[PDB]
Amino acid sequence: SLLELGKMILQETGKNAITSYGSYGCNCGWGHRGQPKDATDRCCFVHKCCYKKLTDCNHKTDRYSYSWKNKAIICEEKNPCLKEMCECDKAVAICLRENLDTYNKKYKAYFKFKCKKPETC
Numbered sequence: 502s503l504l505e506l507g508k509m510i511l512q513e514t515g516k517n518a519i520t521s522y523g524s525y526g527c528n529c530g531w532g533h534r535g536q537p538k539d540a541t542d543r544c545c546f547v548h549k550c551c552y553k554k555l556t557d558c559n560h561k562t563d564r565y566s567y568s569w570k571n572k573a574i575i576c577e578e579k580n581p582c583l584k585e586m587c588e589c590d591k592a593v594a595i596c597l598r599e600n601l602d603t604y605n606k607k608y609k610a611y612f613k614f615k616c617k618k619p620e621t622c
């Protein structure tokens with residue numbers, strides 16, 4: 502669920518997920534995908550594409566089990582779909598942390614309506 506996603510992003514990036522990524526670029530947070538503005542935004546593009554494959558569960562509302570042990574995310578979910586959801590989330594948290602070097606506050610509250618049509622997943 503969004504609960505787990507936000508906890509993973511805070512643990513890896515050190516940033517509040519809604520404030521920093523809830524409206525970042527053309528792909529992070531609310532809305533749909535678009536042409537990424539930078540690397541942080543490409544992370545969220547990949548994340549949303551990763552979510553489209555989850556037909557047997559709900560990425561928004563269904564919670565799953567995971568641990569923050571030794572500064573690393575471990576998915577401890579046995580439900581197959583919720584397991585894929587956890588790995589989708591884990592991937593974006595790690596990806597965003599890796600691109601903290603090029604994170605720019607200008608994209609923080611992006612006007613997502615002017616975003617260009619996204620490429621296919």
Ligand SMILES: CCCCCCCCCCCC(=O)O
Nearest residue numbers: 503507508518522529530545
């Ligand atoms: C625990 C706090 C709840 C935050 C959950 C939403 C996460 C922020 C949205 C941006 C993540 C992304 O799209 O890559």
